[PDB]
């Protein structure tokens, strides 16, 4: 919500949606840039849901956002409408 500490990934929320929400909230957060970096380096992976949190830990600290996106693509999904 009005705090970056309140942003956590939905149980089935696409990782890409969560990161976007996290980003939007962090931009509004009143803190130094170095602190915002610290928040991204810890809170983002920490508040991801259990399934993505596991994939992220595996990729390591050197992973890029694009690599994280690709790795969590489909977790909680596929999210397609049930084609009757």
């Amino acid at each position: 919500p009005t705090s970056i500490l309140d942003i956590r990934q939905g149980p089935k929320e696409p990782f890409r949606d969560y990161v976007d929400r996290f980003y939007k909230t962090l931009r509004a957060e009143q803190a130094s840039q170095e602190v915002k970096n610290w928040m991204t380096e810890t809170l983002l992976v920490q508040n991801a849901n259990p399934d993505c949190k596991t994939i992220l830990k595996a990729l390591g600290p050197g992973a890029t956002l694009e690599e994280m996106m690709t790795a969590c693509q489909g977790v909680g999904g596929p999210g397609h409408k049930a084609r009757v």
Partner: peptide
């Protein structure tokens, strides 16, 4: 990743 990475991704 850092906040700057987020900025470059979505940003500017």
């Amino acid at each position: 990743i850092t906040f700057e990475d987020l900025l470059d991704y979505y940003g500017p």
